[PDB]
Symmetry: C2
Subunit: 396 residues, 2 copies
C-alpha cells in the first residue's frame, strides 16, 4: 500500500538547520532560525514561566481531560488581550474562544470549521506570506489566492496594489491578515490603513481571518492590537487565530487560541458548537500544560508584571539589533541603504540580498540565511555584528 | 456567514455529566465517566509522573520547537513497548513513530495521511465501536463500515459473524482493531483468534490499523500486546495509534503516538515523510510536557518500576471491582447471571440493562449510566457497591 508513495518535498528551514549543524567552521552564524534568541544565542525559558510551572507542580491534583474548548480562564484572558477589557464584544458575549495546539492548530481548526459549515471556498493571503498558510488551508480543501502587499523595490507596503488586488475577491471569501509583525516582511499597515481596510472589508462582504502570532513584538500589547480592534469595531463576524509561542517563549508546548466572533450570543454559541465538533474530530481536546502556564501568569498581578517586562526586553532586544545592524552596515562601507530595516517590525525582514549572494555568504563566510534573503534579526548579537556585516559587505 | 449554521448534536457523555452535576441527590453514582478513578473517587496524578515533572522543572533549559515527529527517545521507547525489545521490526528499522496529541490525534493523522497518499477509501470498524472513530475518519473524507463483533445475546465475541462480515471487505481497505480492552465491550480475541485474523488479513489484502489505548489494563504490558505482535510478525505494512492518556493518567496533556510500519527502511522513510507533511498542515509539531514525562519515566529504571506498580494497582482495582460487582449482585438477589462481567477486560462493559432501565436508575435512584447500558467499573467502589446493586436489582 506504501510502495508508490513519493517523498514529500524538503523544507528549506529544517534543511538549512541540518546544513548549519554539519558545518565545521567557527564563525558560523545562523540567521535562518524561526525563534527568538537572546544576547547569548539561546532560547531560554522565561522566568515567569518557570515560576508558573512550579506553582502547577505543587497545586495540580489531576490530569483529567479539559473541555473541548480548554481552560475557561485561558479563554477570557485571551479575549481581553485581543479586544481589551471593557470591549463590547466581550460584554455582549459575541465571542467564543477555543484553546488550540499552537497558532497553527488554531488556523487548521478554523479551516476545517469553515470548510464544513460555510460556503467559503477561497482564502486570500498576502504575497508573500508565511508558507504554511497554503498547506493548512489546502489541507481543508480550501482554495488559496494571493493579494499584493509587499513592494520589493521600495521595501514597503504598496497599499494601492493591495487594495487593487483585493478587488478581485468576492463576497463570502475570506481574507487573511497578520495582526502585526508581518511574516516575513516586518511591514504592517498604519492605523489609518487598517481603518481603511476595515471599511472596505465590510463593504465587500469579506470574512476577515486574523493570524496574530506576535502580539507585543511590534510596539506593545495594546498597540499591536489596534488593527484587529479596528476590524472588530466594524464587523459582525470575525475569526482570530492567536499564538503564545513567541511572546511567552512556549514554542513546544503548543499554546494558541481560535476566537470566533458573531453578531450575537445565540449565533456565536450555535456556530461555536460546530467548531467544537471540528476539534473533537481532530485531537479531541487541548494540551493543558502550556495553556495552564499562560492562564496562571495572566491572572496573577505579580507574575504578569514580570512577564510583561520579559516581553519588553525581547522587543527591545530586536529593536536594538535592527538599529545596530543598519549602523554597522553603513560603517563597514555598505553600498546600499538599509534604513528600511529600522521601519520593519518583529524578528523578520527581507535583506534584499540575492539568491546568489545568499549562497555565497554561506559557502564563503559561514553566514546562514534563507534563499529568499530572509533574515532573523534575533540571530544577531553585539558580538557577531561586525563579522556578519563585513561578510555581507563583501558580497554586495 | 454564520447565520444559518445549525447547532451540532449534543453528545450524551458530556450531557450526562452536566445532568449528574445538577443533581441535588446525595447517594448519586456516576458510571458514565470515561476515565479511571480510584477508591476515593478521584483521578490523581501518578507519583511517577509528579517525580518526572519535578525533574523537568529543574532540568529544562528551553521550550524550543520539537521536531515534527517529536522527542526521539519517546519514539524508541514507544516502539519497544509495542513490539517488545529485540523485535525484528525495530532492528530492521521498518517502523517510524510520530509523537501526537493523544491517541485521537494519532488516529486523525493516520486518516489524513491515508486519505492523501493512498487509495484507501474505506475503513472497517467493529459494531459497536468507540463512537469517535466515525467522526475522525469521516472528517478525513473516508468511508466507514461496520463489522460484526459483539454478541448482545451471549455477551461474547461472535467470531463467526465477525469473519463473515469482514469477507465483504476488499483488498486495500483498512480494518481497525482495538489492541486490547475493546471499547466498550471489554471483549478481546484470544491469542489463537488474533493469529487467525492475522492470517486472514494477509490473505485478503487488508491494511490493519490498531487503536491501542489501554496497554497494561487487560493482563499486562507485554500480554496486552500479543495481538498486535501477532499481526506485526505477518504483515509488511501496519499502522498503530497508541495513547498514554490512561496508562500514565496523562489524559489532558495529550500524549500519544502514530506508528507506521513498512516492508523496509527506505519505504517507511519515504512514507513517513508524507505523514510529517500531514502533521505540519495540522498542528505543526507536538506538545512536549506530556511526552517528556513519558520518555523520562520509561527510560529511568527507578521511575519505570514505580510506574509499572502504579499501573498494576489500576488494573487490579478494576479486576477487583468487576468481581465484587458480580458477587454483590448475586447476594442482593439478582435475577440474571452477570458472570460475563468477570470475563471482560478494562474499564468498560455493557451491563445488559435496557434503555428504560437506565432511565429509571437515574430518575429513581440517582445512578448514572449511558443509555446503551454501558458502565465504567472504575466508577464503582467498595463503599458504593451495595447501594448500586440494590438499585439495579430494583429495576430488573
Amino acid at each position: 500500500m506504501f510502495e508508490n508513495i513519493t517523498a514529500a518535498p524538503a523544507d528549506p528551514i529544517l534543511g538549512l538547520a541540518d546544513l548549519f549543524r554539519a558545518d565545521e567552521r567557527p564563525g558560523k552564524i545562523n540567521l535562518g532560525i524561526g525563534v527568538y534568541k537572546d544576547e547569548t544565542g539561546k532560547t531560554p525559558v522565561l522566568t515567569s514561566v518557570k515560576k508558573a510551572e512550579q506553582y502547577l507542580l505543587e497545586n495540580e491534583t489531576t490530569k483529567n481531560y479539559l473541555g473541548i474548548d480548554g481552560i475557561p480562564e485561558f479563554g477570557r484572558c485571551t479575549q481581553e488581550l485581543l479586544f481589551g477589557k471593557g470591549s463590547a464584544l466581550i460584554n455582549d458575549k459575541r465571542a467564543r474562544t477555543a484553546q488550540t495546539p499552537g497558532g497553527t492548530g488554531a488556523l487548521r481548526v478554523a479551516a476545517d470549521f469553515l470548510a464544513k459549515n460555510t460556503s467559503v471556498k477561497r482564502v486570500w493571503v498576502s504575497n508573500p506570506s508565511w508558507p504554511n498558510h497554503k498547506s493548512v488551508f489546502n489541507s481543508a480543501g480550501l482554495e488559496v489566492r494571493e493579494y499584493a502587499y509587499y513592494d520589493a523595490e521600495n521595501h514597503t507596503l504598496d497599499f494601492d496594489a493591495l487594495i487593487n488586488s483585493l478587488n478581485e475577491a468576492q463576497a463570502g471569501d475570506v481574507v487573511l491578515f497578520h495582526g502585526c509583525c508581518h511574516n516575513a516582511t516586518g511591514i504592517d499597515p498604519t492605523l489609518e490603513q487598517w481603518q481603511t481596510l476595515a471599511q472596505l472589508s465590510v463593504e465587500k462582504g469579506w470574512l476577515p481571518l486574523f493570524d496574530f502570532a506576535y502580539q507585543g513584538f511590534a510596539r506593545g500589547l495594546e498597540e499591536d492590537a489596534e488593527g484587529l480592534r479596528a476590524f472588530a469595531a466594524m464587523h459582525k463576524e470575525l475569526i482570530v487565530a492567536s499564538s503564545y509561542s513567541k511572546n511567552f517563549g512556549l514554542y513546544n508546548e503548543r499554546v494558541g487560541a481560535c476566537t470566533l466572533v458573531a453578531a450575537d450570543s445565540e449565533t456565536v454559541d450555535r456556530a461555536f458548537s460546530q467548531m467544537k465538533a471540528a476539534i473533537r474530530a481532530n485531537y479531541s481536546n487541548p494540551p493543558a500544560h502550556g495553556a495552564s502556564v499562560v492562564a496562571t501568569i495572566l491572572s496573577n498581578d505579580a507574575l504578569r508584571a514580570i512577564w510583561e517586562q520579559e516581553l519588553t526586553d525581547m522587543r527591545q532586544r530586536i529593536q536594538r539589533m535592527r538599529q545596530l545592524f543598519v549602523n554597522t552596515l553603513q560603517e563597514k562601507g555598505a553600498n546600499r541603504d538599509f534604513s528600511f530595516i529600522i521601519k520593519q517590525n518583529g524578528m523578520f525582514s527581507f535583506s534584499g540580498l540575492t539568491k546568489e549572494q545568499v549562497l555565497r555568504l554561506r559557502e564563503e563566510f559561514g553566514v546562514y540565511a534563507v534563499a529568499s534573503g530572509r533574515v532573523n534579526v534575533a540571530g544577531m548579537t553585539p558580538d557577531n555584528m561586525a563579522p556578519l556585516c563585513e561578510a555581507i559587505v563583501a558580497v554586495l
